[PDB]
Each structure stands twice: as C-alpha cells, then as structure tokens.
Design a protein around this ligand. Structure first.
Ligand code: PLP
Ligand code: PLP
Lengths: 357, 360
C-alpha cells in the first residue's frame, strides 16, 4: 500500500479514484466519458448542480452565498479578490503570518496599496499568530484577507472571525476547507484551490456573499469575474469538467463518511498521533505553537539534516511518498488520508530514529 | 459503438482514454495516479517537458516561440491577449466573421479600443469571408486578431497570413489546431482551448513569439501573464496536471497516426464525405461557401426543422451523440475533430441518408 503525503496536487480518496477508473471510458452507460460530454448537456448539468448542492450542504453554506467553480487556482484568486471586490477603494488589509498570505499580498500590489498586518509572534520559543482581536484594521478598507492554513509553514488560524459588519473577511482555505466545521456567515469570500480536499488540480472553489457582486473592475477578465460567473452558474465558458466531476465524487464520498464533523474527528486523531510522535522524540522537531498547529500540513525537521536524503529515499521505498519539506519534511494528511496511513508513517519514523538517532 | 460529435468538450482518442483508464490508480509503477503527484517532481516534469517537445514537433514550432500550458480556457485568452501584448497601445484590429471572433471583440473592449473589421460576405447565396487583402488594418495597431475556425458557424479562414513585420497576427485556433500543417512563423500568438484537438477541458495552449514578452499590463493576473508563465515553464502555480498529462498522451497518439500531415488527409476525406451527402440531398442543407467550409465543425439544417427532435432522438439511439446545433443558431452540427475516425463520419452519413429515406 502506498500512502501519498503530497501537499498538492494531493491524494484523492482511494474509493473515488477507483470509481473514476471504473467509469472513465463509459460513464453512466452513455458510452462516452464524463470528460467528453457537453457542459451544457442535461447530464453534465446534473453533475455540476449536485456538486454545488453537496458542497453547500457539507459546509452548511447559507443561501446568500454563491458557490463558484472556477479556473486559475489559488493564485488566480490572489488577483480575483482585488479585481472583484475593491470597488472604488484603494486599500485592503492583508494579514501576513506565512508564505501564502505573503504571496497574496504580492499579487494585491498590482491592484491597490495593501496595508500589511504582521501577525507573526513567538511564544515561549514557538511560532504563533496574533489573535484576531489584536489585528489593527484600516477603517473603510475594502476587505480583510488572511490564510487560515499556511500549507508550507504548518500554521493554522482556527478562530472564527467576529469583526464588525463593515469588515469584509476574505480567506484562503485551500489546504483546510472541509476538514472542520466553519461559520461561513462570518465571511465575505472563502476560496480554495481544489487540489487538497476537493478534487484534482485545475479547479478552484469560491464562496462569495451575494451583496459583494456587481462592483468588479472593468479590468477583471470575465473568466475571473464573480458576477459573470454567478450569472452563468460557473459555465460562462467551458469548465474543467473532469475536475468538477471528480470534486462531485469527493463530495459524495464525504457524505458517505458522515460529512465534515466526521472528518474533523478523524483528522484530530491523525494529528494527535503524528504530533505526539514528533514531540516525544528528541530526533524530530516541530516548533509551531500548539494552538496554531495545522492538522493538515505537518512540517518537521530531523536533528541531523544530513539524514534528510536517506529519510526521503527509505520512506519512499516503504510506500510513504512525497514527504519533502520546503527549502526538513512535511507530511500532508488531508481528509483523504486514512488514520492507517499516519500510523504507517509514524511507525516508519520511530524505526528510522532507532536506526540513526 | 458510440460516435460523439460534441463540439467541446469533445471526444478523446479511444486509445488514449483506455490507456489513461488502465493507469489511473497506479501510474508508471508509482502506486499513485499521475493526478496525485507534485508538478515539480521529476516524474511530472518529464510528462510536462515531453508534452511540450511533442507539441513543438507536431506543429513544427520554431525555437523563438514559447509554448505555454495555461489555465482559463479560450475565453481566458480573450483577456490574456490584450493584457499581454497591447503594451502602451490602445488600438488593436479585430476581424469579426463569426460568433467566437465577436466574443473576442467584446472582451477586448475592457482593455482597448478594437477596430472591428467586418469580414462577412455573401457570395452566390453562400456565407464567405473577405480575403485578407480587404481587411483594412490600422497603422500602428498593437496586433491583429482573428478566428480561423468558427466552431458554431462552420466557417474556416484557411488562408495563410502574409502581412508585414509590423503586423502582429494573433489567432484563436481552438477548434482546428493540429488538423492541418500551418506556418507558425506567420503568427505572433496562436492559442487554443485544449478541449477539441489537444486534451480535456481545463487546459489551454498558447504559442507566443518570444519578442512579444516583457510588456504585460501590471493589471494582468500573474496566472495569465505570458512573461511569468514562460519564466516558470508554465508552472508559476499548480497546473491542471491531469489535463496536461492527457494532452501529452494525445500528442503521442498523433505521432502514432503519422502526425499532422496524416490527419490532414483523413480530415479531408471526412469533410468531403459529409459535405457531399449534405450537398447532394434535398433534405439537408449547409450554406457556407466552399472555400470557407470548416472541416472540423459542420453545421446543417433539415428541410423540415419540425423533424429536428426526431433526428436527435434517432441519431442518439443509433450511437451518434451530440449533433444538436448551438443554441444561438439551432439546426444540427457535426463536430468531426482529429479523434473522430472516418468510420464515424461514414456511420453518420449512412444514418442521415436512412433518416431522409424514412421521413423525407
Ligand atoms: C494556502 C494555499 N494558498 C495558495 C496555494 C496555491 O495554489 P495554486 O497552485 O492552485 O495557485 C496553495 C497550494 O497550492 C495553498 O496551499
Ligand atoms: C473558436 C473558439 N473560441 C473560443 C472558445 C471558447 O473556449 P472556452 O470555453 O475554453 O473559453 C471555443 C470553444 O469552446 C472555440 O471553439
């Protein structure tokens, strides 16, 4: 058995990939693939609408939000957010406590002069994030942007936004959407590249509060314009139809598992197991503060990084793929990753420490 | 046997889909799918590089062009072209002789003042396109844009651009790329949504002459910025990795067929067969001029359109899918792309003749 810890593109649920394989050439008895049919045909429209409704149900998205299936990836929305909801405003607040939050800032500078909030703090030697109650917002800012799960850094911000009605909260949920219940009503825009917990790469989900439509910049490409996308139910142009179908299968799989609250419980067990092994070891280390430890992306370093290459070759040979971190290691343990995959990983880690520590 | 005449997403080569199915869960002995691996790993980089190399070989793309594997579809490039190569200019020439060319004009108005060249003409009762010599270009225009294959209208502009060095030709090849050999050197930008002759939907190909880089608008999203995309080998961000892999398989399949010259000959046979049946029947009609008839998208109307529904029900039951014409014009439309075998067009035309016999 191969367990794939890639952060993105990530593993699909094994049952989903098996189903997609079974019907790849002849889908629902049509004699063609789901990827070969018109997006404006009755058959694909049903796939698309069921995927939208399942996503709405899984997250308990209120009726005053649009759910858009978009091209361009997470970095597409780094441009899409300011291009759609700056309106006539020239400032937005961006919270930076990690790589992807900082990347969003860089793109936003094409469109406005962002106010950057440095939310990084060190608490008892551990990397943490300032509480939202301390974020100094700009009166009148068009929106606030933050990243609740920093994929490379292993840093999560779990607290629910509770800002005034004048604050429009936007958030990059790429590497954590569907891993726990969230209060969608507290947000203006939630977006996620699909290639962590939704589907394959090439698809992005955007949840947009409906009153934010209607003020896109004229410069916004129509394929990224939330108002045009909503008008056309995400079929302004040809969608990534196979990716949208696969996302729909993932949503069906999540329903079969018991939904996001069921995932939340298994993800807690997976994270406690892996962080427990790291913390009870002098050979592995993670220095993110407990309250900000991501349950989805778990970086860790070896006490002797001269062993990194051997760790990667031997873990791969043991069927544990894609553990390399950014310029130590990073285990991504998304919804699709079973607890048995994390047990296999930690057993390997304990053995590797016995050998080389 | 099912023949799928969808205009986009379109049929893939059956051999390509069968291979993708076989290796969907365990790709190249990895025990994972090609869609579950990092785009920056050595395995996917090889897929990506071979796909680029194979596309360059198939179309004879010169080395002074970049080949970009992009997000956003054909309509993404309706914005991407002006956002990348207007530079400091405000005028570009747009040729309108069909639905997709007109759609490109509409998007262009967000970014510039297009000079719209109406190239539609009627000759002897048939819809045709003005010769390129009648296209009144604007001195100083940043570029010229046209659509050599109008997917809804069945109108092809096959004539080779022969403009001077000061004209930057850009062209929407979505529904015809790889169907015949073309002279890439005559163009500044060639683009194509993948979901007709390249791969599945979710991927777009852009061929851009290298001297046109470096003048993108600051407003261009980085994911659409040709300079950023080229600098990062189309991996500025996460690619549509499964679509890129499948495109790579299509390119290998095209090589196995004999390449674009081989497909050109088969596509000519397919189009001559289908247009002959339409022309020699009083029951079906197509009113596009011979010189502008697409070989890829063949619209036709029934003499009695009250039989449209029955034609669609009976063709579907005969294994002939997706023949309804676009909602903007009605009628029927047979899309007969590279993947469609001659036997599929023979099955379609035999059906059309039998339908006329039974109901005409
Ligand atoms: C939090 C976060 N933001 C942004 C991205 C970038 O996504 P993409 O490659 O789709 O642009 C990723 C992962 O890919 C991510 O995890
Ligand atoms: C000539 C042409 N241009 C543009 C498009 C639109 O492309 P997309 O739906 O990928 O934006 C199509 C087909 O979809 C096409 O055939």
């Amino acid at each position: 058995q191969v367990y794939n810890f890639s952060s993105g593109p990530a593993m699909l649920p094994a049952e989903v990939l098996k189903l997609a394989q079974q019907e790849l050439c002849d889908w629902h008895g049509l004699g063609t693939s789901v990827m070969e049919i018109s997006h404006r045909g009755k058959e694909f429209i049903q796939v698309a609408e069921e995927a939208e409704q399942d996503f709405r149900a899984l997250l308990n998205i209120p009726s005053n939000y649009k759910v858009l299936f978009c091209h361009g990836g997470g970095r597409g929305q780094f441009a899409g957010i300011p291009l759609n909801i700056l309106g006539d405003k020239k400032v937005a607040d961006y919270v930076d406590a990690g790589y992807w939050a900082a990347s969003a800032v860089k793109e936003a500078k094409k469109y406005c002069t962002p106010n950057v909030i440095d939310a990084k703090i060190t608490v008892d030697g551990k990397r943490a994030v300032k509480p939202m109650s301390e974020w100094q917002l700009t009166p009148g800012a068009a929106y606030l942007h933050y990243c609740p799960n920093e994929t490379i850094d292993g840093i999560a911000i779990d607290e629910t936004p509770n800002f005034g009605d004048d604050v429009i909260v936007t958030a990059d949920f790429s590497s954590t959407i569907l891993s726990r219940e969230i209060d969608v009503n507290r947000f203006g825009v939630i977006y996620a590249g699909a290639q962590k917990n939704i589907g394959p790469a090439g698809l992005t989900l955007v949840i947009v509060r409906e009153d934010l439509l209607g003020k896109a910049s004229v410069a916004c490409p129509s394929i990224l314009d939330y108002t045009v996308l909503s008008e056309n139910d995400s079929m302004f142009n040809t969608p990534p139809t196979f990716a949208w179908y696969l996302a729909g299968l993932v949503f069906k799989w999540l329903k079969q598992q018991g939904g996001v609250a069921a995932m939340d419980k298994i993800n807690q067990q997976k994270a406690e197991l892996l962080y427990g092994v790291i913390d009870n070891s002098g050979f592995y280390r993670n220095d993110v503060a407990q309250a900000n430890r991501s349950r989805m992306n778990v970086p860790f370093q070896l006490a002797d990084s001269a062993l990194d290459k051997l760790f990667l070759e031997e873990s791969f040979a043991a069927g544990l793929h894609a553990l390399k971190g950014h310029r130590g290691m990073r285990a991504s343990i998304y919804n699709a990753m079973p607890l048995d995959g994390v047990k296999t990983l930690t057993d390997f880690m304990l053995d590797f420490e016995r050998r080389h520590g």
